[PDB]
Amino acid sequence: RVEAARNVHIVGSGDTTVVLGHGFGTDQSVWKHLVPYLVDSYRVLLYDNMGAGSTNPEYFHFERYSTLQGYAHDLLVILHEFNIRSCIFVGHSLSAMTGAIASIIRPDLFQKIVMLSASPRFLNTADYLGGFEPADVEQLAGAIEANYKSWVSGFAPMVVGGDMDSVAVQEFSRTLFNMRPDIARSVFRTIFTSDLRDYLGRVTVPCHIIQSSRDMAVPVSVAGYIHNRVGGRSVVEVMNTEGHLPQLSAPEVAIPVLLRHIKNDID
Ligand SMILES: Cc1c2ccocc-2oc1=O
Ligand code: NA
Ligand code: NA
Ligand code: NA
Numbered sequence: 001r002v003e004a005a006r007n008v009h010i011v012g013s014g015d016t017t018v019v020l021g022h023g024f025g026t027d028q029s030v031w032k033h034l035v036p037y038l039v040d041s042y043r044v045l046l047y048d049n050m051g052a053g054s055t056n057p058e059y060f061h062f063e064r065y066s067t068l069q070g071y072a073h074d075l076l077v078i079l080h081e082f083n084i085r086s087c088i089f090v091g092h093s094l095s096a097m098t099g100a101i102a103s104i105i106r107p108d109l110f111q112k113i114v115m116l117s118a119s120p121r122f123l124n125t126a127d128y129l130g131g132f133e134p135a136d137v138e139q140l141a142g143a144i145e146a147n148y149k150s151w152v153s154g155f156a157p158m159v160v161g162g163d164m165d166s167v168a169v170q171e172f173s174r175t176l177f178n179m180r181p182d183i184a185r186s187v188f189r190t191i192f193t194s195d196l197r198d199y200l201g202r203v204t205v206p207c208h209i210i211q212s213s214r215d216m217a218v219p220v221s222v223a224g225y226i227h228n229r230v231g232g233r234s235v236v237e238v239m240n241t242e243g244h245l246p247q248l249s250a251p252e253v254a255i256p257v258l259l260r261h262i263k264n265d266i267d
Contacts, residue, residue, distance in 0.1 A: 004058040005065075007048040008078060012039030016111065017084055018262060020046045021075070023093025023117065024191060025159065025184075026175045026245060027052035030092060033251035034258055041263075045082060049074075049095060050191075051183040052175065061183050068094065068194050072101035079109050088262055090114040093217075093244065097196045104202045112206040114261050116254075117244050118226065119218050120196040128197070131219045137192055144188060148181040158216060161243030168249035200229035207234040208261035212250075214242040233266045 009028065012018075018038055020031045028046035038044050049071055053059055064070035075098055079087065088111050091099040096118035103110040122130045123137060132140075140158070143151040156173040157164040176184070207230050209223045223236045239246060239257055246254040 001058065001060075002062055002074075004056065005048070005053070005060065005062065006074070006078060007053060008082065009046045010043065010082070011035060011046075012042050012044040014042045016041075017043040017045055017087045019079070019084070019087045019089045019099075020044060021049060021089070021091040021095025021099060022052065023095060023244070024050045024187060025155070025172055025179070026092070026248070027178070029171070029175065030245060030248050032248070033255050034090075034247055037255060037259055038262070042088070045078075045084070045087075047075075047078060049098070051179050051187040053178055054180040054183045055178050059180075061180075061186075065187075067190060068098055068196070069101060071095075071098040072105075075099065075102045076106055076109075079106065084109055086111045088112055088114065090116065090258065090262065091118065092116045092247065093118065094191055097199075100203050100207075101196070101199055103205050104199060107205050110205045112208065112265075113203075114208045114210065114258065115226070116210050116247060116258065117212065117215060117218055118209065119222050120200060120226065121194070122192055122217065123195075128225075129219055129221055131217060131222070132192075141188065141192075145181070145185050148184070152176045159244045160249055161212075161214065161216065162249055166249065168243070168245060171248060172245060197229075200226060201231045203230045204232040206232055206266045208266070209234060209236045210254075210257055210261060211238055212241040212243055212246045213238050215244050215246075217244050235261075235266050237261065 096115035241250040
């Protein structure tokens with residue numbers, strides 16, 4: 001059941017639905033410090049993607065999940081099946097891009113996109129700074145197929161930032177361990193070999209572009225890159241936070257920023 005893989009969950013109520021997408025290695029629980037502050041005003045729809053929960057027996061890695069375009073298509077199917085009208089889409093990490101891709105096809109279904117820790121491409125070119133040289137990609141991949149357990153122990157603190165002991169690193173490690181290792185590797189490869197830069201000018205719905213100032217995976221210049229290239233309205237806010245999952249690791253800072261961008265129009 002594709003429904004089992006997505007694990008769509010709804011909470012809250014209101015005239016507007018907020019759809020929350022998550023990044024690689026985590027799941028919808030990454031939004032645990034945001035949801036309490038939305039449910040009074042919004043219906044909230046959460047879903048799992050990018051291989052999350054694939055240690056569940058009922059999980060099957062459908063063919064559509066071979067590409068980020070397939071995830072974008074699947075998001076559109078979710079919006080259809082849950083009768084979504086003009087959602088506020090909040091995408092962490094690559095789900096910002098699957099949301100953006102989807103919004104080019106059904107802009108009528110998106111009131112806005114709020115991007116958190118988004119990047120259209122991690123690998124550098126001669127002319128584009130994504131934050132990774134080839135050596136960096138190969139070193140981050142590390143033991144992902146040799147020894148999944150070892151890989152997680154190194155990957156999780158690097159991505160989350162701060163220090164290995166933090167609850168956020170523990171949480172990210174927990175969700176990584178709810179991924180089947182083969183799926184983690186294939187999705188990791190999909191992501192690092194995807195290049196979404198060409199889509200940006202086709203995006204027309206308003207984009208609120210939020211990131212940590214100190215994110216190992218997303219140089220500060222990436223927020224500006226997106227801002228300069230999208231085809232509709234946009235705004236940038238770079239937070240004084242570290243790490244790729246600041247909604248989990250620095251909620252005291254990140255949650256009020258997210259709420260302001262959810263609740264208020266540009267501009
Ligand atoms: C694969 C991958 C990542 C690796 C490191 O940092 C953030 C990432 O987000 C992703 O989707
Ligand atoms: Na697949
Ligand atoms: Na379906
Ligand atoms: Na608004």
